[PDB]
Design a binder for this molecule. Structure first.
Ligand code: HEM
Length: 152
């Protein structure tokens, strides 16, 4: 279920994300690369990237756009960490294009893990981050399951 964050936890999430927020595209590029390198089955899910060596696509506009769009959503989630309806709407809107896609929960969770690992958070900040991410996935998976209207 969705579990709201405290004022102090919101601050922790904002602070945790600050290094990434100040280098959003650069972080996106690195994290998305590491994701596709560690879990190569996922590259084929992206039609613009399918059929090319990862090292060949990593420097392309197609690749950087995809990475940027993932991180822009997370950036907007962080922006809305204190507004549950707003946070839910960000996810609801991005969920639509994923509904019909053959992407496992494993793949989504693998991406979450790459992001977590890159952030090297202490346990206080990590706890708050995981509260937000648990909310993210609750909303996302509800929407993938056709129960997105509950957040409207
Ligand atoms: C959970 C974090 C994720 C976020 C925030 C996110 C966000 C987005 C955004 C903003 C778009 C652009 C909308 C569009 O033009 O379709 C998109 C498209 C897409 N995403 Fe995701 N995504 C996530 C996870 C994933 C994962 C893990 C995969 C595959 C392993 C994936 C596969 C795709 C595909 C296939 C498209 C549309 C086709 C294209 O890439 O051009 N998404 N996503």
């Amino acid at each position: 279920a969705f579990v709201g964050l405290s004022d102090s936890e919101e601050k922790l999430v904002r602070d945790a994300w600050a290094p990434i927020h100040g280098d959003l595209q650069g972080t996106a590029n690195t994290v998305f690369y590491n994701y596709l390198k560690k879990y190569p089955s996922n590259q084929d899910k992206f039609e613009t990237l399918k059929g090319h060596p990862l090292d060949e696509v990593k420097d392309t506009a197609n690749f950087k756009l995809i990475a940027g769009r993932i991180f822009t959503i997370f950036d907007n989630c962080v922006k809305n960490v204190g507004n549950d309806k707003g946070f839910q709407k960000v996810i609801a809107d991005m969920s639509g294009p994923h509904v019909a896609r053959p992407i496992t929960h494993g793949s989504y969770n693998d991406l979450r893990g790459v992001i977590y690992d890159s952030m090297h958070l202490d346990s206080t900040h990590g706890a708050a981050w995981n509260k937000m991410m648990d909310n993210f996935f609750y909303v996302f998976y509800e929407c993938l399951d056709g129960r997105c209207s509950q957040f409207s």
